[PDB]
Structures are given as structure tokens and as C-alpha cells.
Design a protein around this ligand. Structure first.
Ligand SMILES: Nc1ncnc2c1ncn2[C@@H]1O[C@H](COP(=O)(O)OP(=O)(O)OP(=O)(O)O)[C@@H](O)[C@H]1O
Ligand SMILES: Nc1ncnc2c1ncn2[C@@H]1O[C@H](COP(=O)(O)OP(=O)(O)OP(=O)(O)O)[C@@H](O)[C@H]1O
Ligand SMILES: [Mg+2]
Ligand SMILES: [Mg+2]
Lengths: 497, 497
């Protein structure tokens, strides 16, 4: 025989190193624990909502659904308040006290038909990002079924649970974090506000931020802090989920204002969706003014923001759009892109290319859609005439539509530009090829002898100065079945009757 | 307190979901699988080299140390054989059969006196990255003291091992793969060569991509190919690990031609090294000509590459160098950066900023070196004058240190370049003004007669290469206590002694 003895062994994971690996290696910034906590709190809230819509018996005690963020400056304790499904004994024993395990996955195993709910917690190791900002963790939990219970662990290798005997919650869970002394600056209200606004702006619930009212016992000026900022910043309701049919202008104009900090509305809207293998909506808006980052060539563009399940992920627009279309500002909202471990970067680049093709087709069709208004189209040309020419220089698929998009200054139209098809409209039978010229200004070449021969009869010539167009004439070799003729392609042209 | 009784349970880790996460979530692309195997082979080679250094009597089992790669399109298998330290049964089960447990860390901590040896690998997850494309893995190994075994797994949460009776390897390990039938393009020779060239270029051990066939011998009917040769595999030794004095001009030229694609030599070189709390080595190059894609600056900033422990990581320069250093080419090789689990991104950035400032200072030091050679300095300035004024507008911190480093073709300098630094030798006692004219490029506005009064003094009007000089003179308002003057500024003032 060759190999008679056979032995088998199961895979084991050395624990002690593993939580260290999870804490200090996976996540780029320490600005991420709050997002994870808000995510699984929202998951529990959606669990409550779904199990309550079918049966109101489950929804007892507090009907209102909300999330409270409580930073305690005096003690450094970070308190999180949610009113979700809560925990049980087995829940805290298994679903949180063991790595590589998530409750949502086991929840889908019971709901296998018509699950019209959007959860975010699939991976199962996103809870431990809290150890990045704290030394010890405290979880207050109370199910609608079982009692109140304590989760406590800080040593990394052991945990403690005990039956609660303190204030009762009745419904929901409460998260308490012992923030680290060195990184105590996270307790600043402004920092928390900015992190919430950036990473989880549209979670979809009331984020009240009802921080504890710091009691300060005593014509006289009144006190200024009746309550902390329970405004509609963390409570911003707009999720843009409404269908496009009933959508009006001003509300999405203010939506664009909020997205890009702009004071004015946008220029055009392309609200649509693509289904099948890659299901997603999208909101593309045309910025009104040119981008001033021309000097800063390789600034990381934030024009398009990618949202996965109503959660901001990445703003790297460079791999998401062709560079000749790197000025459109808007939002893409997919729902099935497979995210990596950090929920920060994508994995499938061919999916990105498919989205690229769909987006460019739709937005170039939009370019056609806005072409019917002369004033807005001349504004668009004057503002971003370069990008179409860059595409015509170095894009191959849609050169025809881009060529149709261009307009050009001519003779009989004055200083108003005209499309290449306009000259075809006034084309004469005896001429078999389009005449054009290269010149810095219209009038200087108008008197030039290179077209003075044909000026006696009053023909029309394309006037062309911007150097991209100096180099693009090779790119389009024939439009509408007629080759281009210049005073340099063949010299002084001689059109004869 | 004595209110709620406490109970403690040990931590647990779920196995199957953990490896599903490892396989499908960590690494962005599937090509990385080869790099981890190459790194582990280099690890084994370094281990056996150190064992030889402390005791050379035990290398009788094998003398040459190399990495041998044997692809096979016919069987769809991948083979990597190396002659490093090897495995043992306990090491087998407790390192390959254990997640996140690295024997490299154990060996590295076991010995401390020999800090010279540089080791790569501290996490215990890279070896399982080979499951990205391989449906089955079989590993052969034998120690200098242990017998021959194999380790076979199929990612099914179970593995088996037994004794060996096949081909007796003298020393080292052996990797056998069976890749997916739809990924056979990664068995192609050219693709493997490209990947090896990009990633593991400077490992420092022979990699012999060789598959040799016997050829029959006989009229002009048929002729086939013989074998696969090392496509410049490990023929480029690490330059930075060698002292600067021992590297001469042709070595730098060849290295620059290899790193880039340009047929030309380097315009200038600057090699330096920094030690202490932050230890790294760097190499800098300046091209002999302006970039061919200077007009097409849309290409992302990948000019400077980074290699921690002789492995490429990333060429994103938005955090490594300021953008007005666009044309610099080179490689930075550190030793102690905190790599994440993907080994593509870095978390802490203060090190990045200090490296940036050190590199800026070193680049300015190289700048000074070229200033002595007037002709080469003039050539480089007329080649790359734009980024200087760009940085002058941006870098307020280095504005003064760059202020004295510009030659200038001026009104009375002609083709010869006169510098404001050389000018200070020829100020009169009353002169407190600097004469120039800004614009997009050389223009006829310079022939204005606003400096007729100063024309008796023969003071010199400077030409400005690019429009940012309009903002540059808005950034530098006064040089070493001397004011400014021009047609654009005031036309003509009347300061006199
Ligand atoms: N209201 C809640 N707040 C926080 N955690 C909760 C809440 N309700 C349930 N949980 C627990 O959160 C833990 C969830 O997920 P884990 O952190 O395990 O998954 P993730 O996909 O890695 O991250 P996350 O779910 O946090 O987005 C689950 O095991 C679930 O039991
Ligand atoms: N080809 C090999 N040569 C030598 N040791 C090896 C080899 N393959 C695996 N090992 C050993 O088994 C353990 C496996 O490593 P893994 O590849 O699991 O982590 P690493 O090699 O330690 O680090 P990383 O993979 O993160 O770079 C390693 O730490 C190394 O000690
Ligand atoms: Mg979770
Ligand atoms: Mg390794």
C-alpha cells in the first residue's frame, strides 16, 4: 500500500489573536464604530416593525420608534438608546458572544418568502468595531418576551452576564461604552454630528440625539440649553425613495442643495432604475456652474456618491465614470453590490463597468433630452463644452451621439453657434463635402484669402479655435456622409458650379 | 455588587462562516493568490538561510535556494516548490490547520539578537487566500528532522494528513493546486509573468518559471516551442539596499529604464536614507524630458511607488506626496508600517505626513544640486517650470525655500537664464522692486512703455511661463524685503534714494 493510515482533524481558530486582528487591522479609521452601532440598532428596529405590522400584539409598551445618542462628557460614558427587538439569554450567549455569526442571516432562514425588508448586518463581526474607541462595554437589553439582562466584557477573552436589577427598559436595548481617555475628543458634540451626517445620514428613523440635560442650577438673560440638539439633522426624513411620477421640482432641488451644499437648484434630472442582475435606482443632477478644480488636476473627485442600502460607502468617482463625464453630481443607490469586509470598497469591477455603461447611456440620452431648449443648451455648451470633445478624442462607443451634441460657430448665423446638421440643412447640391477652417477668431479668417475665394458667393465656414478641436478633426472623419474639407486638408478649395 | 449573580463563559468562534468570510470578502481581486505563496516561500528561504548562518553543517540536504514555479495547462494544476525550512507534523496541524496563527511570529519572537533578518508575515490568513481560485489544495513537505507528510483540504471545514511515499523531496515544501475550469486564463504563461513582474519583482531569491519538454529529432513540416524562460525574474537586484557610492550612472540609467518605459536615461538621481524612530529607504528620479502625456494629465497620480518589505502595495500619491511633485519617479521602501489584512491600504497617516515632509525636503536638496550646473538647471527649468509655480501658489510653508530656486529668462538675460538669487548680487542700494509681466504665455503686452523711467537703470523684466504666475505674484508679495512692480501691478512707481 501507499497510504494506509489516514487521520482527519477539524479546523480550529486561535481565539486570543483573533479579536486583536479584528480590532486593530480591519478598519481604516476609528470614525466607524458609531456607524456599525447605528446599523445594527436599525436592524433591530426593522425587525420590530416587520414583526409588528402582521401582529400588533408584539408591539406593546412604547409604540414610538427612535434612536437616542447619549454622550456623557463628565464620565466619558458613551450611551446608545434604541427601542429594537432586544436580546434574550441565548441571544447574548450566542449571537453576540461568538465571532463570525450574525442574527440577520439566521433571521432570513425563517423568513424565506416575500421578505420586503432591508437589513444591513450579514457579516457578523461588525459589532467589535466599538473596541476601537473604548476600553469596556456595557449593554442594557430587555426583550418583549424575557427580562432585562447585562452584557459586560472588556478583557478580550472572557465575558460576564448577569440578571439586571436596575432601571427597567421594557423594550429595546441600551449600549454603554467606556470611551478611551486619550481619544476622549469623540465626546465633542460637533464631531458626533459630523460623523452621523456623513456616514449614516439616511438610516431611516428618528435619531434624536437627546443628550442628557446638563443641569446647571442658576433685565436678566435666560438660560440657553433647555435641551440638546434634537433637530432634523440626524432626523432628516428625505430618503428620496418616492417614485418619480409624483415628484415635484423644489423638494429635490433642496435635496441637491443638501447633497452638494449648494444654494441653488440643479439643471436637469435623470431619475430612473435598472433591474435584473444589478437592481438600483439613481439620481443624476446636472451642476449649473463649471468646476474650478481645473488647476488641481488630480483632486479626488466626489461628484458621485455610492449608496448601498441607504448607507454611504465610497465617493471614489474615478473608477465609476469615464473621465470625459466627471462633472455630473448625483447619487447612485444600489441594493445588491457585494461589499468587502469593511463595507468601504467594492469587489466586482465588471459590475462597475456594467453600471458605467448604463449610466453613460442614460445620461447621454439626457443630453439629448435637454437639447430641445436652445438657451439651456447654449448654457451647457458654454459651461462644459470641453468634456464632449475629450470624449470624442478618446472614446469610441458613442462618438456619433457626441458629434450630434456639438454646435459650432459659422458665417450666416452670426456669433450664435449651430450644429453640424444645420450646415447640412443649408447644404448646396454642387458642394459634395463640408467646408471648414481653422482660426482663432471668426472675423480674422473671414478676411483671410483661404476662404475669401468662396466668400464672394457667401458660403458658410466652420470657425474653430479651441485646441482640442484642433486635434479632434482627425477623430471624426465624416459626418452625415460627407468628408470634412479645410483650407489645409486640400489647400484653397475651389467649389465649381 | 451582591445584587445580580455573575457567570463567565469563554469566547467562541464559528468555523464555516469564518472561512466563507476569508475566501469571499477580504481581497478585492483574485490575482493576489500567487503573491501570498511567493511570500511564504521567501519566508521559508530566509528561515533556512538564518539556520545556515547560525549552523551551516545542516544544509547538506540542499545547497541552492530558489523558488520553482511549474504551471501546466494540460492538467489545469499549479505547482510551487521551494527548499526553505519546511514543516513538521505539529507545525503542520497548528499553523496550516489553525486560523490566524502564524509560526512566523513565533520564530521572530523566539530570537531577538539577530535583528538583521527581515521577515514578512504576521497574520495567519494569507495562506487560505489561495482558495480564491483553487477548488482543492494539496501540500507536500518534509523537515530536516521530520519525515514526509501531506496536507489536503477542500475548504469543507475538514482536512486530512498522512505519511508520504511518492517522490522523495530532499528538503522544503511543495504546493499543488487544482484551479477552477473557468479560470484557466491564469494558467497562461504571459499573465503569470505580468503578475510576477508587477508584485513580487524584488523578493530577492531566484524564481525560475520553467517547464521543459523533450523534443524529437528527424523536412520543413513541423517545429514547436521548447520551454519557458525567466522573463527578467530576479535579474534586477534591490538598488536601495546597496550603498549610494557603489551605484554608478549606468546602473541608475538601467534601473530607471526598467522601472519606467522610457528608452532614455534619467535626467537626475537622488538617493538617500533615513534612520531612527522612522526608518526607510528611498530613490528619486527626474525624467530627461517632459511627460509625453503632459497634455493628457487625466491619468491618475501613480508616479511614485511604495514597497514595504520589498512588496508593492499602492501608488496612490494623494496622501504620500504633494501634487506639485508630479514628475518625480521613484520607489520608497520602509520596514515597519502597519499593514491591514488586505495589504493594500494603510490606516495611520501621521507617518505618511512625516514621510511626505522628509521627501519634500530631500527633493529640494536634489533641487539645489542641479542649481550648480547652470546648463542642466536651465534645461530642467524649461522642461518642468510649471510645477514650481504651482507649488509656490500652494505650498506657503516652502514658499521662501523655493523662491530662491528659479532661474528666469528675462528682458536682458536673453537665452541665458538670470536668477533672482543671482540678482541680489546686483541690486542697487535704492532698488526695492522686481520687474516682470504675467500672462498665459509670452505675449505682446510686454512691449508696453510703463517701465520707460526704469529703462535708464536697465532693470530686468521677467517672463512668466504659465497663468498661475498671476496667483504666484499674489502669493509672493515680497522677496527678502523687496517689493514688486509691473504693468499689471502699478505700471510705474516712484521710489528713489
Ligand atoms: N438593537 C441592537 N443594537 C445592537 N446590536 C443588536 C441589536 N439587536 C440585535 N443586535 C445584535 O447585533 C449583533 C449583530 O451583528 P454583527 O455585529 O454580529 O453583524 P455585522 O453584519 O458584522 O454587523 P452589524 O450587524 O452590527 O451591522 C447580532 O448578533 C444581533 O444579535
Ligand atoms: N510555503 C511555506 N513556507 C514556510 N512556512 C509556511 C509556508 N506556508 C505556510 N507556512 C507557515 O504556516 C503558517 C502560515 O501562514 P499564513 O500564510 O497562514 O500566514 P503568514 O505566512 O504567517 O502571514 P500572511 O499570510 O498574513 O502573510 C505561516 O505563518 C508559516 O509559518
Ligand atoms: Mg451587528
Ligand atoms: Mg503568510
Amino acid at each position: 500500500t501507499d497510504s494506509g493510515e489516514v487521520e482527519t482533524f477539524a479546523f480550529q481558530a486561535e481565539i486570543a489573536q483573533l479579536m486583536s486582528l479584528i480590532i486593530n487591522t480591519f478598519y481604516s479609521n476609528k470614525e466607524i464604530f458609531l456607524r456599525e452601532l447605528i446599523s445594527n440598532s436599525s436592524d433591530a428596529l426593522d425587525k420590530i416593525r416587520y414583526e409588528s405590522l402582521t401582529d400588533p400584539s408584539k408591539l406593546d409598551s412604547g409604540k414610538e420608534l427612535y434612536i437616542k445618542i447619549i454622550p456623557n462628557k463628565s464620565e466619558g460614558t458613551f450611551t446608545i438608546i434604541d427601542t429594537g427587538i432586544g436580546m434574550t439569554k441565548a441571544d447574548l450567549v450566542n449571537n453576540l458572544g461568538t465571532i463570525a455569526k450574525s442574527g440577520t442571516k439566521a433571521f432570513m432562514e425563517a423568513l424565506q418568502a416575500g421578505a420586503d425588508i432591508s437589513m444591513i448586518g450579514q457579516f457578523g463581526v461588525g459589532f467589535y468595531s466599538c473596541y476601537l474607541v473604548a476600553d469596556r462595554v456595557t449593554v442594557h437589553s430587555k426583550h418583549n418576551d424575557d427580562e432585562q439582562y447585562m452584557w459586560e466584557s472588556s478583557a478580550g477573552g472572557s465575558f460576564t452576564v448577569r440578571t439586571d436589577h436596575g432601571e427597567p427598559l421594557g423594550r429595546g436595548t441600551k449600549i454603554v461604552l467606556h470611551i478611551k481617555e486619550d481619544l476622549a475628543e469623540y465626546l465633542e458634540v460637533n464631531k458626533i454630528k459630523e460623523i452621523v451626517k456623513k456616514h449614516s445620514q439616511f438610516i431611516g428613523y428618528p435619531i434624536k440625539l437627546t443628550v442628557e440635560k446638563e443641569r446647571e442650577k442658576e433685565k436678566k438673560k435666560t438660560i440657553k440649553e433647555k435641551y440638546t440638539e434634537d433637530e432634523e439633522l440626524n432626523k432628516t426624513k428625505p430618503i428620496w425613495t418616492r417614485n418619480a411620477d409624483d415628484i415635484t421640482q423644489e423638494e429635490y432641488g433642496d435635496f441637491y442643495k443638501s447633497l452638494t451644499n449648494d444654494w441653488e437648484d440643479h439643471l436637469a434630472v435623470k431619475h430612473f432604475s435598472v433591474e435584473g442582475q444589478l437592481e438600483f435606482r439613481a439620481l443624476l443632477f446636472v451642476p449649473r456652474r463649471a468646476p474650478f478644480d481645473l488647476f488641481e488636476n488630480k483632486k479626488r473627485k466626489n461628484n458621485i456618491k455610492l449608496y448601498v442600502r441607504r448607507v454611504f460607502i465610497m465617493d471614489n468617482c474615478e473608477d465609476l465614470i469615464p473621465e470625459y463625464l466627471n462633472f455630473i453630481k448625483g447619487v447612485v443607490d444600489s441594493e445588491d453590490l457585494p461589499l468587502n469586509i469593511s463595507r468601504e470598497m467594492l469587489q466586482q469591477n465588471k459590475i462597475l463597468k456594467v453600471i458605467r455603461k448604463n449610466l453613460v447611456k442614460k445620461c447621454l440620452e439626457l443630453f439629448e433630452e435637454l437639447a430641445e431648449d436652445k438657451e439651456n443648451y447654449k448654457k451647457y455648451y458654454e459651461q462644459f463644452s470641453k468634456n464632449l470633445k475629450l470624449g470624442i478624442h478618446e472614446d469610441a462607443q458613442n462618438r456619433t451621439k457626441l458629434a450630434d451634441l456639438l454646435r459650432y460657430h459659422t458665417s450666416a448665423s452670426g456669433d450664435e453657434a449651430c450644429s453640424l446638421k444645420e450646415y447640412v440643412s443649408r447644404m448646396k447640391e454642387n458642394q459634395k463635402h463640408i467646408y471648414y477652417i481653422t482660426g482663432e477668431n471668426r472675423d480674422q479668417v473671414a478676411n483671410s484669402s483661404f476662404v475669401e475665394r468662396v466668400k464672394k458667393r457667401g458660403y458658410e465656414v466652420v470657425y474653430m479655435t479651441e485646441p482640442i478641436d484642433e486635434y479632434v478633426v482627425q477623430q471624426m472623419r465624416e459626418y452625415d456622409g460627407k468628408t470634412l474639407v479645410s483650407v489645409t486638408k486640400e489647400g484653397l478649395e475651389l467649389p465649381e458650379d
